[PDB]
């Protein structure tokens, strides 16, 4: 283009982080979340109890791991769902986390470890 290039972006994360979860007729490791206004959700980000993300100093309040892509513009998920679903009970997930600036990964994992969540070393 005008400066030679035109990047158009890349694909959002797919929900392949789940390796093992407690299968149950009504769902066991999944809980619904009311999306916070003007908030964007992607697969991997850690959520607090109210539904917001985890900032610096709030690692011990890690509640769940998002497994949906939510858009604040449409107020809908990428699968046409009204609510955000995260993994909070016992499960095993790939180590493809998504944390904001200043968040301690080890502290966040420790909070989820005590809640039954296990992480597998992924690598590249």
């Amino acid at each position: 283009a005008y400066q030679g290039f035109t990047k158009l972006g890349e694909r959002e994360p797919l929900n392949d982080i789940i390796l093992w979860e407690e299968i149950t007729p009504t769902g066991h490791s999944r809980k619904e979340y009311a999306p916070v206004a003007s908030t964007e959700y992607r697969v991997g980000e850690v959520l607090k109890a109210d539904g917001s993300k985890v900032a610096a100093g709030q690692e011990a309040q890690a509640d769940s791991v998002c497994i949906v892509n939510f858009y604040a513009d449409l107020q809908l998920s990428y699968h046409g769902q009204l609510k955000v679903v995260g993994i909070y009970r016992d499960a095993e997930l790939k180590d493809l986390l998504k944390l904001e600036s200043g968040v301690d990964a080890a502290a966040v994992k420790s909070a989820l470890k005590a809640k039954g969540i296990d992480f597998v070393p992924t690598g590249l």
Partner: protein, 52 residues
């Protein structure tokens, strides 16, 4: 093995050789494991790259 020294003939002197030596060792091995899973969530409504 070792070299041999000459001795006198009238005196019936001679010499001998040392025995051998044996030992034993052990080896452990390395274990590798890889796990992967596939779910419908990564297939539903996903465009194949390179296609419209």
């Amino acid at each position: 093995i070792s070299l041999l020294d000459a001795v006198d003939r009238t005196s019936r002197k001679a010499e001998t050789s040392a025995p051998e030596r044996v030992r034993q060792i052990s080896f452990p091995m390395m274990y590798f494991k890889e796990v992967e899973s596939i779910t419908p969530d990564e297939i539903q409504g996903v465009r194949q790259p390179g296609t419209a």
